[PDB]
Design an enzyme around this catalytic site. Structure first.
Site, PDB file in Angstrom:
ATOM      1  N   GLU A 110      -7.242  -8.022  -0.372  1.00 31.38           N
ATOM      2  CA  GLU A 110      -7.683  -7.928   1.117  1.00 31.38           C
ATOM      3  C   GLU A 110      -9.095  -7.524   1.315  1.00 31.38           C
ATOM      4  O   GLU A 110      -9.445  -6.807   1.016  1.00 31.38           O
ATOM      5  CB  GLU A 110      -6.760  -7.063   1.864  1.00 31.38           C
ATOM      6  CG  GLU A 110      -5.368  -7.544   2.241  1.00 31.38           C
ATOM      7  CD  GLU A 110      -4.927  -6.427   2.938  1.00 31.38           C
ATOM      8  OE1 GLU A 110      -5.254  -5.712   3.680  1.00 31.38           O
ATOM      9  OE2 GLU A 110      -3.482  -6.035   2.745  1.00 31.38           O
ATOM     10  N   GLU A 132       0.747  -1.233   0.172  1.00 30.84           N
ATOM     11  CA  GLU A 132      -0.067  -0.018  -0.089  1.00 30.84           C
ATOM     12  C   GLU A 132       1.162   1.261  -0.062  1.00 30.84           C
ATOM     13  O   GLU A 132       0.666   2.121   1.043  1.00 30.84           O
ATOM     14  CB  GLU A 132      -0.952   0.104   1.296  1.00 30.84           C
ATOM     15  CG  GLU A 132      -2.033  -1.024   0.972  1.00 30.84           C
ATOM     16  CD  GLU A 132      -3.236  -0.914   2.162  1.00 30.84           C
ATOM     17  OE1 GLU A 132      -3.033  -0.140   3.109  1.00 30.84           O
ATOM     18  OE2 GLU A 132      -4.392  -1.320   1.888  1.00 30.84           O
TER      19      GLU A 132
HETATM   20  O1  LIG Z   1      -5.807  -4.975   9.201  1.00 30.92           O
HETATM   21  C1  LIG Z   1      -5.265  -3.771   8.808  1.00 30.92           C
HETATM   22  C2  LIG Z   1      -4.777  -4.224   7.487  1.00 30.92           C
HETATM   23  O2  LIG Z   1      -4.626  -2.772   6.697  1.00 30.92           O
HETATM   24  C3  LIG Z   1      -4.162  -3.153   5.421  1.00 30.92           C
HETATM   25  O3  LIG Z   1      -4.195  -2.113   4.565  1.00 30.92           O
HETATM   26  C4  LIG Z   1      -2.867  -3.943   5.195  1.00 30.92           C
HETATM   27  O4  LIG Z   1      -2.431  -4.041   3.929  1.00 30.92           O
HETATM   28  C5  LIG Z   1      -2.744  -4.961   6.001  1.00 30.92           C
HETATM   29  O5  LIG Z   1      -1.319  -5.409   6.221  1.00 30.92           O
HETATM   30  C6  LIG Z   1      -3.254  -4.849   7.438  1.00 30.92           C
HETATM   31  O6  LIG Z   1      -2.448  -3.919   8.025  1.00 30.92           O
END
Ligand SMILES: OC[C@H]1O[C@@H](O)[C@H](O)[C@@H](O)[C@H]1O
Ligand SMILES: *[C@@H]1O[C@H](CO)[C@@H](O)[C@H](O)[C@H]1NC(C)=O
Ligand SMILES: *[C@@H]1O[C@H](CO)[C@@H](O)[C@H](O)[C@H]1NC(C)=O
Ligand SMILES: OC[C@H]1O[C@@H](O)[C@H](O)[C@@H](O)[C@H]1O
Ligand SMILES: OC[C@H]1O[C@@H](O)[C@H](O)[C@@H](O)[C@H]1O
Ligand SMILES: OC[C@H]1O[C@@H](O)[C@H](O)[C@@H](O)[C@H]1O
Length: 705
Positions: A229, A160
């Site tokens: 994600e 990110e």
């Molecule tokens: O649970 C919060 C998540 O936020 C996302 O943006 C990140 O890519 C993950 O590594 C984790 O930190």
């Protein structure tokens, strides 16, 4: 032999377009013997890929020395996914965020001359390329990329970075171009990805993270639509509640993505696991990384979420032949209703019928047939004729958690931690205040800020009823104030605001007075622009008010320092370390006293159920079993926040379904059975705040109906 490519539709594995269902499982947040069972349940959950970060700081604790044994055996982990017939998405980083200590970066990396984290920086690039290069080479050497016949079908470089590139400007674009060019230049034979990277350079594909990602589109028309994600919940922080995301919402969000051209999605997290030891969790992040994942912290099936998602994946797999052979065609059904139809020239038809109204249930007609759509739901018709699945309609069993005590209380033994004061023979001193990471290098959570205060007999507060006033300002994260070896007060911060101020009257007598400050770091920041440059520890101002002279600036004098605890250097956590038996075996002994070590011996309970420690009787510190760090405990920090009842329907946010408030942030602490002998297990607890050891109980984790 084997090949991985991509087009505008999907990822192409061995010449065939694939709709890929992924789930994120981090290897060091579980034990090597737990891995097979977790991967099996993931396979049974309907997942094609296992996704995982690579954790630099866990692999390279020293500038030269490497670690890839135990639960840091990355090669063991990937080979296990292979034995299960699944693929792997290797999110290398090296920045991983992941609520992981220092964002995954090793602490020593900060102190390399001329270093700057995540930018067009030579010392950083060299360091970054070195490790990334090592990881790719190790993967090649064990033939682990799909092109070699392995499971790894793609890799992620950085995490990110888009938002950071935005804030820092031109050095940001240069570093991004470099990172991409470098990663692709390693000839992995598999595609490279970048999450939250709106301008990811070819041939890198930019991917999406968040609760919903259906409106997302890649930066190029010939790049597939991917969601790296799908947040299955949210993390727990010490001081915070336990957040949950409803299964019906997750399924809806996934369906919204698939119906609209989406070809790859990954559950973050599928298994959250635990932050073992003191180098795993990020700033104020709890030991538990349950995340409300389909597989709970202990590896048990989080129902109904697990089963409901399993059914969703069965529906998508039935819809797959159509999904890969056509594109999403929208046909309106009503005010808040749509039909996404995938119609192949072959004649294969898959349809998704949506109802975005979150208030009322809606009825629609699709191809002469009526369909009832619950509010905020999507129905999947894999043959275009019959609805096999609906996101708001759960046909899977619910289950609750019960923690059953196993055996009884333990015979405890206690050892007192010393309260160090400044001596004249101190080697590590400075004429001011030093930053905590600079001194400790994160080798311990603890640092002692020590100084001497000389009180002249002609002072005003000595003769009358007046007290001197002490003000100590710290950058974080916990501060204990000792005056003349005795505790005067304790302050602790939050994730949002970790900065501290202690203020209060002190007992000072004539002569030299010794001040001892214990500054504790509860994990290191893992996210934010220039987050590494943030301070920890007492940097002042530090004033002593109420003297003959107005107020003495205590910051501008000689300060002694001590890294860690006498209990740590003696290695009291291990069995061979707990040899200096200054242990009070007292029938009657230590209770609710700051800075205290405890040890007991127990036998492994008889069964298969996973184990935890009820630590509700305690305050803060860390736990070891048979020498191995279970992680930090902080039952003394009570959960804060609004925690109303929630409905699955409607836009989700992290705070929508919060639970366990007005309760200890974490009460039970995960103990892997893998760490136990049948009998003669050593349980060492360092208690920082103060608690009763006799209250500590070993419990059995059971779920049902
Ligand atoms: O649970 C919060 C998540 O936020 C996302 O943006 C990140 O890519 C993950 O590594 C984790 O930190
Ligand atoms: C799906 O992708 C195709 C290929 O570009 C595009 O023509 C179509 O508009 C997309 N469908 C939707 C609903 O966005
Ligand atoms: C870090 O420690 C060094 C000595 O090891 C000292 O010279 C320097 O002032 C310290 N920096 C900070 C910001 O504390
Ligand atoms: O940017 C990647 C770098 O890789 C190094 O191995 C090489 O010496 C540099 O010239 C540069 O190409
Ligand atoms: O606590 C120190 C840091 O805290 C962060 O939350 C903040 O974004 C930084 O600017 C810095 O103040
Ligand atoms: O279900 C997905 C939805 O998520 C909401 O937060 C958003 O406002 C909508 O535009 C839609 O994207």
């Amino acid at each position: 032999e084997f090949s991985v490519s991509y087009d505008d539709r999907a990822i192409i594995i061995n010449g065939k377009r694939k709709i890929l269902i992924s789930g994120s499982i981090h290897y060091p947040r579980s034990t090597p013997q737990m891995w097979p069972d977790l991967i099996q349940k993931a396979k049974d959950g309907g997942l094609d890929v296992i996704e995982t970060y690579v954790f630099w700081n866990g692999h390279e604790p020293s500038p030269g020395k490497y670690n890839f044994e135990g639960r840091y055996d990355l090669v063991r982990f990937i080979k296990m996914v292979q034995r299960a017939g699944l693929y792997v998405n290797l999110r290398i980083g090296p920045y991983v965020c992941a609520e992981w200590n220092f964002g995954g970066f090793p602490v020593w990396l900060k102190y390399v001359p001329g270093m700057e984290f995540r930018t067009n920086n030579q010392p950083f690039k060299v360091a970054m390329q070195g490790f990334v290069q090592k990881i790719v080479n190790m993967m090649k050497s064990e033939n682990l990329f799909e092109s070699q016949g392995g499971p790894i079908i793609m890799a992620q470089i950085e995490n990110e970075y888009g938002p950071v590139e935005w804030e820092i400007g031109a050095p940001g674009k240069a570093y991004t171009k470099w990172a991409a060019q470098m990663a692709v230049g390693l000839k992995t034979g598999v595609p490279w990805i970048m999450c939250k990277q709106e301008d990811a350079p070819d041939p890198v594909i930019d991917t999406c993270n968040g609760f919903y990602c259906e409106g997302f589109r890649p930066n190029k028309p010939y790049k597939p639509k991917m969601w790296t994600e799908v947040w299955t919940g949210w993390y727990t922080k010490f001081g915070g509640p336990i957040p949950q995301r409803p299964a019906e919402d997750i399924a809806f969000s996934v369906a919204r993505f698939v119906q609209n051209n989406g070809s790859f999605f990954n559950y973050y997290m599928y298994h959250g696991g635990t932050n073992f030891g003191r180098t795993s969790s990020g700033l104020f992040i709890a030991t538990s990384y349950d995340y409300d994942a389909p597989l709970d912290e202990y590896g048990l099936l989080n129902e109904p979420k697990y089963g409901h998602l399993r059914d969703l994946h069965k529906a998508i797999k039935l819809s797959e032949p159509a999904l890969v052979s056509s594109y999403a065609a929208v046909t309106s059904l009503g005010s808040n209703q749509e039909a996404h139809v995938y119609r192949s020239k072959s004649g294969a038809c898959a349809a998704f019928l949506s109802n975005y109204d979150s208030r009322y249930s809606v009825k629609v007609t699709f191809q002469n047939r009526p369909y009832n759509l619950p509010p905020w739901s999507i129905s999947i018709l894999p043959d275009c004729k019959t609805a096999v699945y609906n996101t708001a309609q759960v046909n899977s069993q619910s289950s609750s958690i019960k923690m059953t005590p196993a055996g009884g209380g333990l015979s405890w033994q206690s050892y007192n931690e010393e309260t160090p004061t400044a001596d004249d023979s101190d080697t590590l001193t400075a004429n001011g205040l030093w930053e905590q990471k600079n001194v400790t290098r994160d080798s311990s959570d603890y640092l002692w800020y020590m100084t001497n205060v000389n009180i002249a007999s002609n002072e005003g507060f000595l003769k009358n009823g007046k007290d001197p006033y002490l003000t100590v300002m710290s950058a974080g994260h916990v501060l204990h104030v000792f005056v003349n070896g005795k505790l005067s007060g304790t302050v602790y911060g939050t994730l949002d605001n970790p900065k501290l101020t202690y203020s209060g009257n002190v007992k000072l007598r004539a002569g030299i007075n010794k001040i001892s400050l214990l500054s504790v770091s509860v994990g290191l920041p893992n996210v934010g622009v220039h987050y590494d440059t943030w301070n920890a520890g007492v940097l002042g101002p530090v004033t002593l008010s109420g003297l003959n002279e107005g107020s003495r600036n205590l910051a501008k004098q000689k300060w002694s320092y001590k890294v860690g605890l006498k209990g740590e250097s003696l290695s009291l956590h291990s069995l061979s370390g707990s040899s200096s038996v200054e242990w009070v075996r007292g029938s009657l002994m230590a209770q609710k006293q700051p800075l205290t070590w405890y040890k007991a011996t127990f036998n492994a309970p008889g069964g298969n159920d996973p184990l935890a420690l009820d630590m509700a009787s305690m305050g803060k510190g860390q736990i070891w079993i048979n020498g191995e760090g279970v992680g930090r405990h902080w039952p003394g920090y009570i959960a804060q926040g609004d925690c109303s009842k929630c409905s699955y329907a409607g836009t989700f946010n992290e705070k929508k379904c919060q639970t366990n408030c007005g309760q200890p942030s974490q009460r039970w602490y995960h103990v892997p059975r893998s760490w136990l002998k049948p009998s003669g297990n050593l349980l060492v607890v360092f208690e920082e705040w103060g608690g009763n050891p006799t209250g500590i109980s070993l419990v059995r984790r059971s779920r049902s109906a």
